[PDB]
């Protein structure tokens, strides 16, 4: 459904932490140290159905600084169970 | 560095066409046929000096359907000259 830019407050930073933690479990970029999530941060709201406002979940697209390098991460969250998954983690990328 | 999501009106579509035209000149992605720019479309305002008012130009991050595949393209536009450049182009990427 809809997209919006969100600020980089505690909630967002904690999404970055989730992303680094999970990537660290995967191990493709070594041992990473979360530094910071930077602007911009995009949120997509995913609705359960056309015609209705029930929210199925969200996707977040982040730029996350870890171990002095900048990466892109995409994170899904289920509205109901609050489960999050790391959909993509890529970099180093150039600064936005 | 300041961001906003913009709609995919004729202006934006024309940016898509420019991206495909330019990529076609470059030839690193084959011979492409522009179809459509889809949501979401992010516009960055680029200031001459960060924290200060004067606008140097803009950057547009697009999702562009060409030849039935989806690519990511970033386009800069200079505020004073209106010159545009294709900063990058890649894909195929999964739908946002």
From Swiss-Prot, chains A, B:
Biotech and industrial use: Natural monellin has not been mass marketed to the food industry, primarily due to the challenge of large-scale purification of the protein which is relatively sensitive to heat or acid treatment.
- Keyword Lipid biosynthesis listed? The answer is no
Q: Does the keyword Oxidoreductase apply?
A: no
Name of protein: Monellin chain B
Keywords carried by this UniProt record: Taste-modifying protein
Q: Which organism is it from?
A: Dioscoreophyllum cumminsii (Serendipity berry)
- Which portions of this protein are annotated as coiled-coil regions? none
* Cited InterPro entries: Cystatin_sf (IPR046350), Monellin (IPR015283), Monellin_B (IPR002095), Sweet-Taste_Mod_sf (IPR053768)
Q: Subunit info?
A: Heterodimer of an A chain and a B chain.
Which Pfam family, any one of them, does this sequence belong to?
Monellin
């Amino acid at each position: 459904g809809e997209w919006e830019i969100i600020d980089i407050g505690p909630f967002t930073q904690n999404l970055g932490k989730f992303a680094v933690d999970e990537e660290n479990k995967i191990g493709q970029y070594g041992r990473l140290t979360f530094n910071k999530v930077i602007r911009p941060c995009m949120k997509k709201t995913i609705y359960e159905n056309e015609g209705f406002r029930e929210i199925k979940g969200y996707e977040y697209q982040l730029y996350v600084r870890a171990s002095d390098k900048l990466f892109r991460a995409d994170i899904s969250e289920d509205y109901k169970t609050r489960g999050r998954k790391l959909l993509r983690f890529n970099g180093p990328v150039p600064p936005p």
